[PDB]
Design a protein around this nucleic acid. Structure first.
Ligand SMILES: [Ca+2]
Ligand SMILES: [Mg+2]
Ligand SMILES: [Mg+2]
Length: 430
DNA sequence: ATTTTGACGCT
DNA sequence: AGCGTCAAA
C-alpha cells in the first residue's frame, strides 16, 4: 500500500533512429529516398549481406541478414547502397559520424546514455520538472504531441491509424491532473512533449527520422519505442503495464531475448511477461539467481532501477574481420597482413578519438577464431597499448597469438584463422 | 558464408 | 584476466 514503491520516480526516454544506415545513405543519395532499399556489406558472395532495410523494402519481406541476391527475389526493384571498403574490409566510419551528429543534438536536451550506434536513453526527470514550472498549471494541448501514441488507448465505449492515435491521445489528455506537479502520468506527458521537441530537432538538423519510447525506466522506454515505429513515439504509463504485459512474450523484453528468457519460459511454464507476477521474489531468485530474480520480480510489475548512465562516447574502439570457408588464413604472411590492415584502421580511429575526446586507450585486446569452433571467439589475449602505431600494434597482436599455430612449419598457420579482432580498451584522460 | 560491431556479467 | 551473454546496424 502506502510503502509499495511503484517505480514512478523518473522519466526516461529511449530514442532509436529508423532504419538508420539506410537513412544515412538516403540523405547522401536522394535517388534512394522513398524507395525500397537496403544497405549491404560486400558484394561477391550472394550479392552481399543486408544489414539495414527501408520500410518500403520491409513491405516485400526483405530483412536483415538476408543475402542481397535473395532479397532481390522478394523485391526485384530493391535499391542497394554498399558499405565503404577500406584496407580490404567493411568500414563503418560514415555511420559512426552520423551517430555523433544525433548524439550531440540529443545531449543539448539532457544527459544521454549511448546504447548503440543509433540509440540513446535520456533521463528527462529534471527537464520535466523545469518544464512543469514553466507551464504554470497550463493544460497540455494535443498539438504539442503530434506524433505520440498512448499505449492502451483508446479504450471502452474512425477506422484509420491517425484517427485511432488521436482518439487515444484525446482520452489520455482529457483525464490528466495538470494541477498536480507530482503526478507521474503528468510527468510522463511533459516528457513526451520534450521528446517531440528533441525528435523535431534531430530531423531538422540532420534529416533523420526516429522513434522513441517514454516511460519510467529504460526497459519500458525501449519496449515502448518499438510499439509504433517508424517516425512515431509511444508513452507507456505505469497503469498500462498489466494489460501490455498480459500478452507480451517474455523474449520481447530487453535482456530476455536469449538463453535466460528461454529458461524463464521453460522452467516456469509461462509465455507472457505478466505471468511472472505469480511468483515470489525468492522463487525467481532460486531459479535465475539473486540479481536476475530481483530484477524479474520488479520488472514484471513495470519497475526497474537501472540508471541512465552519463556516457555519450563508446568505451571501446574495435576492428574485426571474418574469413569464412575457403578464405580462412592459412599462412603466416596472410595473418600478419590482415593484422596490419586491422591495426591501420584502428590507429586511424584511435588518433581521431584522441584528438576529439581527450583520451587515450591503454590496452589492446586481440581475439581470434580457429576453423572448427562454434563460439564467436576462440581465444582472447590482452597486451599493453602504449603507442598509436599500426605496425607496433599488429606486431604485438601477432606476438600474443603466434603460439596458437599448431603447425610444425613456421610458414604455415594451422588451424586456419576464421576471424581476427583488435579492440582498444581502458581509456584514460589525456 | 551474415558481418562488424559494442556493453556488461561471471568466476 | 579470459570467457560468455545479449544486443545493434
Ligand atoms: Ca534503429
Ligand atoms: Mg537501435
Ligand atoms: Mg533493427
Amino acid at each position: 500500500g502506502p510503502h509499495m514503491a511503484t517505480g514512478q520516480d523518473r522519466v526516461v526516454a529511449l530514442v532509436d533512429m529508423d532504419c538508420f544506415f539506410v537513412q544515412v545513405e538516403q540523405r547522401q543519395n536522394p535517388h534512394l529516398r522513398n524507395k525500397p532499399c537496403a544497405v549491404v556489406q560486400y558484394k561477391s558472395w550472394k550479392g552481399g549481406g543486408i544489414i539495414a532495410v527501408s520500410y518500403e523494402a520491409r513491405a516485400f519481406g526483405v530483412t536483415r541478414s538476408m543475402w542481397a541476391d535473395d532479397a532481390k527475389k522478394l523485391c526485384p526493384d530493391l535499391l542497394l547502397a554498399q558499405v565503404r571498403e577500406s584496407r580490404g574490409k567493411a568500414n563503418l566510419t560514415k555511420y559512426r559520424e552520423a551517430s555523433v551528429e544525433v548524439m550531440e543534438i540529443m545531449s543539448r536536451f539532457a544527459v544521454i546514455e549511448r546504447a548503440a550506434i543509433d540509440e540513446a536513453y535520456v533521463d528527462l526527470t529534471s527537464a520535466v520538472q523545469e518544464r512543469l514550472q514553466k507551464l504554470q498549471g497550463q493544460p497540455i494541448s494535443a498539438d504539442l504531441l503530434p506524433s505520440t501514441y498512448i499505449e492502451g488507448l483508446p479504450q471502452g465505449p474512425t477506422v484509420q491509424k491517425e484517427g485511432m492515435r488521436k482518439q487515444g491521445l484525446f482520452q489520455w489528455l482529457d483525464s490528466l491532473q495538470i494541477d498536480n506537479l507530482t503526478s507521474p502520468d503528468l510527468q510522463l506527458t511533459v516528457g513526451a512533449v520534450i521528446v517531440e521537441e528533441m525528435r523535431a530537432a534531430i530531423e531538422r538538423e540532420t534529416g533523420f527520422q526516429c522513434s522513441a519510447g517514454i516511460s519510467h525506466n529504460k526497459v519500458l522506454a525501449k519496449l515502448a519505442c518499438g510499439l509504433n515505429k517508424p517516425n512515431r513515439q509511444t508513452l507507456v504509463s505505469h497503469g498500462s503495464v498489466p494489460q501490455l504485459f498480459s500478452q507480451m512474450p517474455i523474449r520481447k523484453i530487453r535482456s530476455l531475448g536469449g538463453k535466460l528468457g528461454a529458461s524463464v519460459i521453460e522452467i516456469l511454464g509461462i509465455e507472457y511477461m505478466g505471468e511472472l507476477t505469480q511468483f515470489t521474489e525468492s522463487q525467481l531468485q532460486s531459479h535465475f539467481g539473486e540479481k536476475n530474480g530481483s530484477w524479474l520480480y520488479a520488472m514484471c510489475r513495470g519497475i526497474e532501477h537501472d540508471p541512465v548512465k552519463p556516457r555519450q562516447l563508446p568505451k571501446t574502439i574495435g576492428c574485426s574481420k571474418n574469413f569464412p570457408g575457403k578464405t580462412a588464413l592459412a599462412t603466416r604472411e596472410q595473418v600478419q597482413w590482415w593484422l596490419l590492415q586491422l591495426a591501420q584502421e584502428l590507429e586511424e580511429r584511435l588518433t581521431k578519438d584522441r584528438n576529439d575526446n581527450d583520451r587515450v586507450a591503454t590496452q589492446l585486446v586481440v581475439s581470434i577464431r580457429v576453423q572448427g569452433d562454434k563460439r564467436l571467439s576462440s581465444l582472447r589475449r590482452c597486451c599493453a597499448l602504449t603507442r598509436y602505431d599500426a605496425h607496433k600494434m599488429s606486431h604485438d597482436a601477432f606476438t600474443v597469438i603466434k603460439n596458437c599455430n599448431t603447425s610444425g612449419i613456421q610458414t604455415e598457420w594451422s588451424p586456419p584463422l576464421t576471424m581476427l579482432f583488435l579492440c582498444a580498451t581502458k581509456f584514460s584522460a589525456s
